[PDB]
Design a binder for this molecule. Structure first.
Ligand code: CL
Ligand code: CL
Ligand code: CL
Ligand code: CL
Ligand code: CL
Ligand code: CL
Ligand code: CL
Ligand code: CL
Ligand code: NA
Ligand code: NA
Ligand code: NA
Length: 129
């Protein structure tokens, strides 16, 4: 599923992501924009042979199991395929564990490079939330 901007903002809010670990909803929307362009089915192979999955490009080295990532962990206890769902629950639950990991939203390099310090509130501008 390809979400609308306000549509994804609303689902992220519904799933308790607004201000989770102190990150406003605009941050999460901005990250999703640059990670996946709001597309739940997004996948991207990394140079190290791991893969990133879903609206938040969660990586198979640490977080989910895809069956093809040597020496990896599955810290969210989920097949990476669950992260491609039109229902965002698995992605939100796993992103909560990632952002609690110690480096906050810096875990998402696109967030650090494209969202961090910006006017992220623009991402939820005009949304009925
Ligand atoms: Cl947009
Ligand atoms: Cl915001
Ligand atoms: Cl393969
Ligand atoms: Cl694996
Ligand atoms: Cl594990
Ligand atoms: Cl699995
Ligand atoms: Cl959803
Ligand atoms: Cl933080
Ligand atoms: Na894996
Ligand atoms: Na893994
Ligand atoms: Na393997």
């Amino acid at each position: 599923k390809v979400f609308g901007r306000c549509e994804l903002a609303a689902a992220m809010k519904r799933h308790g992501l607004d201000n989770y670990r102190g990150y406003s909803l605009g941050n999460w929307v901005c990250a999703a924009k640059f990670e996946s362009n709001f597309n739940t089915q997004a996948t991207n192979r990394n140079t190290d042979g791991s893969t990133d999955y879903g609206i938040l490009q969660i990586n198979s080295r640490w977080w989910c199991n895809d069956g093809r990532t040597p020496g990896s962990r599955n810290l969210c206890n989920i097949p990476c395929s669950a992260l491609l769902s039109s229902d965002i629950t698995a992605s939100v639950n796993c992103a909560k564990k990632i952002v609690s990991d110690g480096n906050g939203m810096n875990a998402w390099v696109a967030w650090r490079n494209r969202c961090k310090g910006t006017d992220v509130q623009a991402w939820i501008r005009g949304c009925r939330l």
